[PDB]
Write a protein that binds this ligand. Structure first.
Ligand SMILES: CC(C)[C@H](N)C(=O)N[C@@H](Cc1ccccc1)C[C@H](O)[C@H](Cc1ccccc1)NC(=O)OCc1cncs1
Lengths: 99, 99
């Protein structure tokens, strides 16, 4: 779909059998989700944003279905104010900016 | 232009007579720039991101030319890692997401 930006670009996702809403975020290099119990192995990681940084758990090769388009990639999980779909997954669903 | 997301969506801006590069950021409600000496009145403001928050100066009705398209709006100025063009200005240049 084509999405205008008068409101936040929130979409429904399904990940790890759970339904969530997440922001399509072209400023984010990586995907960062609120605390959830993704199964399997991981690696602690530090990421920085406006405000400073947070500690996250890095999960690789995780399936996410982002507005009905499947993608597999790294998902960081941690103390975020908002679930963020970053460019690592946006590129897999074919997302572009246009003006 | 149409912009893919394999790299950061950086564009050239001109603001306050100065040339800068900024990120087209659909996840940001507001526009936040690194410290610069925008002339005129303003109001101190707190904004939150990943990591916590920062204090900024809020400047209204500031002209910015974002990849050649003019826009006027609020610009927050403060201690950001990266210059961010948020939706307040993206909507003025007609920016959409597409997949
Ligand atoms: C993987 C990313 C999440 C990454 N850690 C991250 O925060 N990138 C941001 C750019 C950046 C990079 C390094 C250091 C500082 C800032 C851009 C994201 O697009 C972020 C998304 C966002 C996160 C939290 C709350 C609101 C937006 N944008 C954002 O800070 O615009 C600024 C705001 C405007 N109003 C409230 S904050």
């Amino acid at each position: 779909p084509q999405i205008t930006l008068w409101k936040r670009p929130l979409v429904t996702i399904k990940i790890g059998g759970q339904l969530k809403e997440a922001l399509l975020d072209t400023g984010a290099d990586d995907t960062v989700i609120e605390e959830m119990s993704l199964p399997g192995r991981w690696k602690p990681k530090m990421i920085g944003g406006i405000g400073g940084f947070i500690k996250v758990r890095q999960y690789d090769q995780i399936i996410i279905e982002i507005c009905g388009h499947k993608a597999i990639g790294t998902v960081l999980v941690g103390p975020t104010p908002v679930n963020i779909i970053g460019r690592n997954l946006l590129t897999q669903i074919g997302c572009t900016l246009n003006f």
